[PDB]
Design an enzyme around this catalytic site. Structure first.
Site: not given
Lengths: 123, 124, 135, 123, 128, 135
Positions: F9, F49, F57, F85, F91, F103, F113, F116, F127
């Site tokens: 990100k 998203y 949000f 993962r 998270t 993270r 963070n 993804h 995705e």
């Protein structure tokens, strides 16, 4: 055996490279005899806190060990990070131009003497 | 291909740098063909003996092979004096301060590698 | 202080992770009391895995351990046994091995999980006597 | 300031050194302005995708920063990884022979401008 | 944004792990607001360890004290250090889980709460 | 045997952690099958998203992911989905991410963070088809 003064310049601190620079000193076999994060202010520059840096945050340290002065300068590398500094040095691996070359080490036992007395009184 | 013998000197073992030295060899693209932690007692012209390139103490012997292995190891190790001779980025330039305690040894020629390999690793 | 036997299995050798694995042991504060790259004979493999005789995965364990050279070591220091198991991580590198372990950082499946450490004091003594009878 | 083109040759991808090479560029102070894993087929060779590589997967990147051209050549090291590349460089630390020296960076400002327009059109 | 006190214990200096510990703090996204290598006196050691009412290791050699600042700095430092017992509690990937073996020599300390962070900072770095 | 989508990100790009993140994927044994630094379009953001639409949000997610370039990648190998993962960590970088994860070692708060990874086989397929149509 020998003692030298090393400064992590403001650009070195701003880039989160304090530990990386100390690690290379430590793995070389040298010991950290003194260490302190300092703030130096504004206001030739011989023998002052601004002799080798611009005003800003700086980490001063006394590095001790066999041939510490020459070994620190070896670790640091030449002045120009691209033109003079060898790969594997602090400046060669982490820096681009002389103005922001991260670190400074004493260039002689003469300089280490007064420099250490300047940054660490009574050491 | 090509073969060379490496010794991690006692000061390299005392300083917990066995894996670090082997890591640099492996990431260079070379393979460890043999490996053994040894002890060497004090022998009272040192040529062709276990104490030729080391002093009394524990030592890790290893056969390293790969393209240009002999020269590659000498490059990784660096010059004799770790401050005045060894370049930054080498084992000696990065980890050592004085010649007496410069961590590692690598064969300097094919004939040396042949002799040293048969000494530390008979039959290999 | 304790002693434990560490094996870098053939997949760890094939992947040239010897130095990385020994580095994690050393920086943990443990010492290397013995170290040897060697080939595992059929006899030794059956001795090392004797506890698994009769289980369906016994044959494949013998085949794998004899498929290529290994590195055996005696690792020594305070709580060496549990410390090595901690460094290695759980069996399944993804479902059990915590991040930051050898298996968690470097491996993906159980049959290729790189390393082994003695699981107890009794096993440590048994395996050291088998792999390094003179130590 | 400057921009240069970096290629991670197929041998560098095979040896899983993409992150390591990119990591050494970033820690030098340079930024990755563009990046893409490419496939290049087989077809002197001047101005073509196969000028500095043989057919195979390749990672192309635009590297940006002060003295980016000379900095990347410094990080990469001389052609022969043992006889020319210095310790602490990518080739000096990770490669053994010229045939498989892992990485390529533009050797001049004209080459950078030309190579960037080829691998990243419109950049 | 918080401040927390980090101590690199004497065994951490002996083993030349100052840079390694600070590197992990910095790459986590935290900043070093204060840093000093110093020797601990009897008076200061009694104040820090005043919580134990029922001959100290902290006065044997020098220590490095540091203020670490940033988002969730207190919890982040504890996460970086790991549980007390480096083998039975500290998670792999932590300072203790990666570098230490027993509670007696677990290298580093971090304030365990906002209250203790303020008391420890006021003790080790008055005027900070 | 599996493919998953990995996003670095904008905060991961801003902090120049591309090489560090790719290194951790590579040393795990996983391969980079696709890789591209790009800017996320308004359309792509609302598509990535879309499962959060209608929420309050939802606007903050679109603004952040288009605030700067990202690196998108397809990571491939055994158990690639669960392995990625594992590498990324929970998270919340402090309260959930384990030490040794991306993270856990590099991030402090959820909104920054860094990375993804697809959370399931269905999500991986969805995705990948969105970010890498031709793959």
């Amino acid at each position: 055996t020998e003692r030298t003064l090393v400064l992590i310049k403001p650009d070195g601190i701003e880039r989160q490279l304090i530990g990386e620079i100390i690690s290379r000193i430590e793995r070389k076999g040298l010991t950290i005899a003194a260490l302190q994060l300092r703030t130096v202010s504004a206001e030739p520059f011989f023998g002052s806190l601004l002799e080798f840096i611009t005003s800003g945050p700086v980490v001063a340290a006394i590095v001790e060990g066999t041939a510490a002065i020459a070994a620190v300068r070896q670790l640091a590398g030449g002045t120009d990070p691209v033109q003079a500094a060898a790969p594997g040095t602090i400046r060669g691996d982490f820096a681009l131009e002389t103005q922001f070359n991260l670190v400074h080490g004493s260039d002689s036992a003469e300089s280490a003497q007064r420099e250490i007395a300047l940054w660490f009184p009574g050491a």
